Ligand SMILES: Nc1ncnc2c1ncn2[C@@H]1O[C@H](COP(=O)(O)OP(=O)(O)CP(=O)(O)O)[C@@H](O)[C@H]1O
Ligand SMILES: [Ca+2]
Ligand SMILES: [Ca+2]
């Protein structure tokens with residue numbers, strides 16, 4: 001460990017005793033592993049704690065019941081409500097339903113965490129180091145990195161350990177340090193010592209902290225600290241979780257839960273304002289104080305009833321349940337609420353290279369110049385065999401094997417490929433295959449040089465490791481590479497400044513080797529390499545070249561082309577400024593065209609099928625890439641974005657064509673175009689911006705850093721598992737499988753969550769409206785009170801509890817993917833659904849009021865009150881003045897109240913079965929499709945029986961029930977609500993709107 005940034009780069013190398021150009025030795029790693037251990041963290045991976053995870057109570061709807069539980073305990077502390085023990089029970093039926101949902105919520109989330117960590121553990125984090133094993137570079141498991149060895153980082157990488165920067169190989173080096181210092185914008189680094197030992201992490205501008213990403217550039221450094229000695233390691237538990245998330249679904253639910261909290265506020269204020277006239281009845285006893293307080297209780301007890309306290313839990317359950325299902329499809333949900341958003345997505349933007357395609361590349365076609373005779377131009381087209389990164393294959397011309405060394409243009413094409421290249425070939429001795437190091441594109445050139453072998457290097461008797469970079473090491477032995485002009489997405493090309501390695505002649509040898517996008521390089525080509533000679537770039541030549549390039553990119557091979565050129569007379573080293581890269585394009589002028597290579601890059605096997613499925617789900621797909629349009633168009637046709645013969649005149653644009661359009665037609669283009677090529681990281685970020693300006697939910701799929709702005713901007717970023725860390729950090733979901741078909745299943749799961757969330761709402765609204773209607777109806781018609789504040793708080797515990805939450809386990813509808821996606825501007829509750837809520841709640845209230853009233857009449861055991869509703873309270877005690885009041889006092893009886901109660905419990909259990917699907921009949925979506933619901937109902941019902949028959953309990957809640965004759969009655973009344981809602985489903989089942 002070196003806790004020093006105040007020390008210079010030489011002082012840091014001296015600290016561990018390492019050479020910058022060799023690295024650590026096997027013995028040195030053995031010893032440093034004993035001393036410093038592995039590079040990893042032991043425990044508590046975003047695990048929270050046992051009791052502090054259940055402290056998620058801090059939701060508004062839940063908070064209300066908490067305060068309600070206190071004032072229900074405060075009034076109880078006075079022993080009020082004309083009762084002793086049941087007063088202390090009131091706050092506990094409230095706590096129980098909260099404890100219930102809080103447990104299920106926590107229970108589900110812990111499973112999501114345990115599914116995620118099992119998947120991240122299936123693919124180890126990696127890092128690149130230089131050790132004395134090889135002259136070359138080797139990347140290892142991030143855990144096998146020790147304080148001392150020389151580590152290499154680059155664009156899109158995640159910094160594996162706390163590293164003192166040694167050499168910044170690029171013009172600039174920017175780092176995303178948001179995870180540690182909060183610095184949003186990318187941060188520049190350097191290599192000079194920071195003498196202050198006490199300097200804060202923000203000022204350590206010569207350090208690379210672990211867990212952070214490289215925004216731009218390439219750098220070499222030395223590891224100071226690993227494992228827990230890492231800066232981010234010291235703050236593992238402290239600041240465990242910090243994120244930003246406010247999804248559209250969450251926003252709608254917050255707006256819903258807010259205004260819904262306002263109606264219940266008024267109703268319960270109304271409830272208290274209405275029955276302020278029964279303030280003095282001989283039951284409560286004329287005590288005005290104990291009159292308004294009782295109805296303050298029923299108002300609060302009704303609030304608790306009406307309020308969906310399970311809403312924060314059912315949201316939590318569905319999301320965590322969704323995160324787990326996606327984890328089974330090898331997807332990593334980096335944000336629970338984001339699963340819901342991918343359900344109501346209308347358009348999906350996608351990167352091409354490495355996202356829609358496999359990014360497994362290989363040069364299979366290439367041409368140079370044959371002859372230029374006036375208006376006549378001819379090329380030497382070549383075919384190369386071998387599609388893997390292996391150096392076994394042959395160069396062909398008209399299907400005949402050819403020594404590449406004979407053609408001089410091929411010697412130069414092989415030279416530009418070898419030098420103007422930052423990648424290499426490693427032969428994995430444990431996998432037994434040739435793997436790439438760096439970009440797949442540049443690597444495709446590396447293997448080409450090997451297959452060409454223009455200098456005929458003996459390779460028949462080499463090892464499989466030596467064979468990897470033989471023909472390339474020959475060219476590097478020949479040419480000393482002075483420095484590299486970076487690849488810039490503005491000029492879309494790069495170059496190396498090279499002189500003869502042996503330095504045989506200073507005057508004779510000096511070249512700049514350029515490769516990049518054809519149209520750019522060729523436009524800057526003033527000469528054309530014919531053989532070993534040189535001729536001026538003319539119209540016909542440029543036409544003939546670009547014609548064959550078009551022949552390849554549009555062809556059924558779908559080729560990826562790079563033009564190769566050499567600036568014959570480059571500027572002097574001191575005539576060039578390497579600080580900025582904006583000057584680099586002019587350095588790549590006066591070029592001499594050498595040749596063009598064409599790459600193979602097959603679309604992923606399941607892309608075409610996935611795209612076609614989205615088209616059936618009302619979802620549009622837009623390809624966005626920095627590659628050629630002609631090539632990009634022919635891919636869209638092959639994967640189902642365009643037809644084989646679609647007219648794409650105004651549905652495919654380039655970066656220049658797009659920008660040439662007014663901001664009006666720039667925005668309009670995004671509504672019809674499905675292919676944008678030759679674009680920028682900003683373009684990708686703006687195409688999403690334009691799509692979002694149409695009130696559409698947008699998803700972005702990428703793998704590179706050029707996607708990061710677009711990935712962050714979209715409602716859902718989706719990065720490939722084989723993609724970059726920057727892309728993954730920018731996205732909310734990661735396809736670790738690289739399976740594009742998962743995006744399809746993530747949409748189906750996303751819509752299924754929205755539906756179950758609706759069924760939760762429809763249930764708790766339609767049912768609880770009945771709870772409101774019940775109290776409002778008995779009062780309006782001058783009937784005895786149906787419910788007691790404790791009875792209101794019991795039905796709430798049992799009907800708003802688990803049967804509510806179990807709705808989050810509903811199987812999705814059968815036609816869930818055949819319907820168009822839901823508009824973002826849709827009301828959470830439609831105009832028609834609000835009618836269903838009332839129709840059910842209307843009957844429910846009526847059904848449960850007629851319950852208590854029936855006891856007063858047609859019940860044989862109950863005393864009769866004749867016909868035409870003779871219910872008035874004048875009798876009371878000593879009915880001296882009355883109308884046919886043979887009975888002394890029928891009021892304040894426990895029996896009629898339990899009748900109204902048991903109906904509610906049964907009738908609200910009933911439409912929970914109706915809440916299995918929005919429109920599907922119970923004949924196609926039976927009760928046993930959601931077993932968790934049946935369990936809740938069984939429990940909830942059996943929990944009702946226990947209260948009625950275990951005798952220390954019916955004293956607490958005023959009730960006494962007949963064993964059979966009453967249960968038969970409440971069933972006759974409850975079951976029709978299943979019938980009623982069934983009618984309403986059939987109504988929308990035959991009339992399809994929505
Ligand atoms: N390493 C390299 N050296 C020189 N030129 C390169 C290069 N890599 C890419 N290019 C050229 O730059 C152009 C744009 O690169 P860019 O990264 O912006 O788009 P891209 O197609 O390579 C990634 P994607 O297709 O996933 O959007 C490419 O079309 C290619 O012709
Ligand atoms: Ca409730
Ligand atoms: Ca890419």
Ligand SMILES: [Ca+2]
Pocket residue numbers: 305764767768771795796799800908
């Ligand atoms: Ca209810």
Ligand SMILES: [K+]
Pocket residue numbers: 711712713714715716717730731732
């Ligand atoms: K995003």
